[PDB]
């Protein structure tokens, strides 16, 4: 199992609607997590199961999807979300993580 | 002689226009491997089991 | 809930180090960890996996066969046997909690990892 996010980078100014997706290449139905990646840090935990908001993430993240096609929005740019992002699947145990991708100021 | 009594407990929520999370599962896979019904209870038979 | 790592260093292609990692603020026989990579410039990779009882380990087709993952769980502790680290293992590793509790009786899926610890990159 591979996965492919698309777009590899982009670029946006603060209070921009960016969305984002990253495809699965095969049905994982709802078994897809999103993850926050601050260079220099290790990563955290945004959301899984492709829907839910973690208790420790503010609001202004969501995402949908189901099958083999995954989305992630964000409802407005903050100035601390310039990091990279990404998403992996567990509907195996032999889990993969996706291409990656970053997210620029503007 | 070793007989393994596996029991497998899977479930999901159904799914469809709604999303919810906290509500109870609505589909339940249990099994007991070789169990069969019909055939009647599965009984340990060796000196061992796990 | 805090991840410490050690053992980062550099040693010569072919010979063996000995990772760990520990866990503190949780119960810690109840959830499966698992070690991850990162290359330079690349993104996140996945080393090896063990459930929360040991009983069951799991690696990828390319560590395969080549490194051994354990735990101790007297001790909170978590440990990875490198042997024959090849050039392409210098990375960073992390080690991760999955976010289900289970029971020391079980066994179970994992995936959703939610806390990491600081990191510990390594040479070769
Ligand atoms: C309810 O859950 C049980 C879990 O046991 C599901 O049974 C499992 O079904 C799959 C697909 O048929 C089996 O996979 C394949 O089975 C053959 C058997 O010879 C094996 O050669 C393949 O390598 C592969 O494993 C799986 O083994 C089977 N497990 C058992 C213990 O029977 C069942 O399908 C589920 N049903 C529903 C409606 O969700
Ligand atoms: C096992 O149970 C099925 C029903 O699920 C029954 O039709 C079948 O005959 C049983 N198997 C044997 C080998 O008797």
């Known amino acids: 199992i591979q996965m492919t996010q698309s777009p590899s980078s982009l670029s946006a100014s603060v209070g921009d609607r960016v969305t984002i997706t990253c495809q699965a290449s095969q049905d994982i139905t709802t078994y897809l997590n999103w993850y926050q990646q601050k260079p220099g840090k290790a990563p955290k935990l945004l959301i899984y199961?492709?829907?839910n908001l973690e208790t420790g993430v503010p609001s202004r993240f969501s995402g949908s999807g189901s099958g083999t096609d995954f989305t992630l929005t964000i409802s407005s740019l903050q100035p601390e979300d310039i990091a990279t992002y990404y998403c992996?699947?567990?509907?195996?145990?032999?889990?993969?993580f996706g291409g990656g991708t970053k997210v620029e100021i503007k | 002689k070793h007989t393994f009594i596996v029991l497998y407990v899977n479930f999901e929520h159904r799914r469809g226009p709604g999303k919810c999370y906290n509500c109870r599962p609505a589909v339940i896979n249990i099994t007991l491997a070789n169990f069969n019904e019909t055939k009647g209870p599965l009984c340990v038979d060796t000196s061992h089991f796990t | 809930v805090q991840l410490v790592e050690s053992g980062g260093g550099l040693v010569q292609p072919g010979g063996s180090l000995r990772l760990s990692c520990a866990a503190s603020?949780?119960?810690?026989?109840?959830?499966?960890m698992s070690w991850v990579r990162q290359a330079p410039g690349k993104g996140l990779e996945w080393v090896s996996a063990?459930?929360?009882?040991?009983?069951?380990?799991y690696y990828a087709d390319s560590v395969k066969g080549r490194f051994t993952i354990s735990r101790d769980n007297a001790k909170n502790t978590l440990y990875l046997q490198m042997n024959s680290l090849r050039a392409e293992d210098t990375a960073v590793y992390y080690c991760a909690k999955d976010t289900t509790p289970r029971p020391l009786y079980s066994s179970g899926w994992y995936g959703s990892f939610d806390y990491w610890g600081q990191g510990t990159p390594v040479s070769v």
């Open positions: 603020g949780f119960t810690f026989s109840s959830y499966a």
């Open positions: 063990i459930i929360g009882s040991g009983s069951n380990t």
């Open positions: 992996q699947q567990y509907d195996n145990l032999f889990l993969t």
């Open positions: 199961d492709a829907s």
